[PDB]
Design a protein around this nucleic acid. Structure first.
Ligand code: DCP
Ligand code: CA
Ligand code: CA
Length: 430
DNA sequence: ATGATGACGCT
DNA sequence: AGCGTCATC
């Protein structure tokens, strides 16, 4: 009882941008605002494949992966922006540069872990403590939290949704332990007020809206962020967890969306995250290994110790192109040419990274695929990255793959290549 | 025939 | 080192 760790030691937030790429396109072209639209890659094949969808467009059933032409059946008025194309390949710099905008603002509040192009985790333990001293044990006005939901409230003994939001908010705030500094619920609340600030800062300074989750760890924060999208934040407290997890499908938890999660269901015969609490740490370890068993044991009780890593920049930089079906590469003459195009973009990206961030990459990973094989990568080989020269990298990248070419006939390339991937890594200070 | 990323774990 | 998983970058 008194020596049980309840995982209330930190305050963590996850901020993720709403329909990010679409927002970037809509800030640029006002015609796309307040309209079902989507962001698209390579117009030729079926209007291009959709990679981002506005919320107005989601109301018609339009989804990522979907071809635009199919998407226009569900929603004839759908507007598209296209990804910039630069060497017969998609160039994402617009959305990288837009992400930096966001990460720099967030970096002003707390040290962030960049988790993707449009999302970072934040550790607010310090900012909350330091802010608790500044408020003179005064209450927290509801006006400090104009977009916050409290998961599981209102409960106990106004139909429209802002009505409920306020009701849970007041119920929560009315019940608060302002006298106690180390009350975890009070901490989450201060954290939440800071995130209102962060988010109001992001929008003022970029015009981009986001949602956020606030909890005691990265996995709850992540989960919480999804609960009230778009343009809202959610607080998931320790106490809400049993009810939240009691009907939460296991696959909704980060790192259980794939096969490990599939086997937790199949082995244990359960559907929901709360059903894991009926199993011992030893039982869980026997089934899924020591590291998973322990992590699962804790997680279903809302406890997770994975830290918010101080890393605003990427640790690898890379470019891939897929050559599906008919298009697969079957002449060394065109393997060169694509390795050159890739290497060119990479060099563009690398030299920028060297001046911006004061670091140089030192290793060049070269991956490829071959026709028939249905695994992201067939093989993967490293070599030194001594110089930011596209012709040298692409040559080196070629050198590192011929072996694989089964062709006795010299001009050709067998079997054909379904994908080329080049990636800079082993960074070092510069 | 979504395609283009990136982090991390296991051996 | 090189392969595999996870997520969504
Ligand atoms: N498989 C994917 C997933 C995402 N993205 C890009 C486009 C998205 O705009 C952005 C962020 O993706 P999210 O999965 O966070 O989803 P969105 O931000 O598009 O919308 P939301 O997060 O509001 O659901 O990353 C992509 O190119 N390919
Ligand atoms: Ca997003
Ligand atoms: Ca995201």
């Amino acid at each position: 009882g008194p020596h049980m760790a309840t995982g209330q030691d930190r305050v963590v937030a996850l901020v993720d941008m709403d329909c990010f790429f679409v927002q970037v396109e809509q800030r640029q072209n006002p015609h796309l605002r307040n309209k079902p639209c989507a962001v698209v890659q390579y117009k030729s094949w079926k209007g291009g494949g959709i990679i981002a969808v506005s919320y107005e467009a989601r109301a018609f059933g339009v989804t990522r992966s979907m071809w635009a032409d199919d998407a226009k059946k569900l929603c004839p008025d759908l507007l598209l922006a296209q990804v910039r194309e630069s060497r017969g390949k998609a160039n994402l710099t617009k959305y990288r540069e837009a992400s930096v905008e966001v990460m720099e603002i967030m970096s002003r509040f707390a040290v962030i872990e960049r988790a993707s192009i449009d999302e970072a985790y934040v550790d607010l333990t310090s900012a909350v403590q330091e802010r608790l001293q500044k408020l003179q044990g005064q209450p927290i006005s509801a006006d400090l939290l104009p977009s916050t939901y409290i998961e599981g409230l209102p409960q106990g003994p106004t139909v429209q949704k802002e009505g409920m939001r306020k009701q849970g908010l007041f119920q929560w705030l009315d019940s608060l332990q302002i006298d106690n500094l180390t009350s975890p619920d009070l901490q989450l609340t201060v954290g939440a007020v800071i995130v209102e600030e962060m988010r109001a800062a992001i929008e003022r300074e970029t015009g981009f809206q986001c949602s956020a989750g606030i909890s005691h760890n990265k996995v709850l924060a992540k989960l919480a962020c999804g609960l009230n999208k778009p343009n809202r934040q959610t607080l998931v407290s320790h106490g809400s967890v049993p009810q939240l997890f009691s009907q939460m499908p296991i696959r909704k938890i980060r790192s259980l969306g794939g096969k490990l999660g599939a086997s937790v269901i199949e082995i244990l015969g359960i559907e929901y995250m709360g059903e894991l609490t009926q199993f011992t740490e030893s039982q869980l370890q026997s089934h899924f290994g020591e590291k998973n068993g322990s992590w699962l044991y804790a997680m279903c009780r809302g406890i997770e110790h994975d830290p918010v890593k101080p890393r605003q920049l990427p640790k690898t930089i890379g470019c891939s192109k897929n050559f599906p079906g008919k298009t697969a590469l079957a002449t060394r003459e065109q393997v060169q040419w694509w390795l050159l195009q890739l290497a060119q973009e990479l060099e563009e990206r690398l030299t920028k990274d060297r001046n911006d961030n004061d670091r140089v990459a030192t290793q060049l990973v070269v991956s490829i695929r071959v026709q028939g094989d249905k695994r992201l990568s067939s093989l993967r080989r490293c070599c030194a990255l001594t110089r930011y020269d596209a012709h040298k990298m692409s040559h080196d990248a070629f050198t590192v793959i011929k072996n694989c070419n089964t062709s006795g006939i010299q001009t050709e390339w067998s079997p054909p290549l379904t994908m080329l991937f080049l990636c800079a890594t082993k960074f070092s200070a510069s």
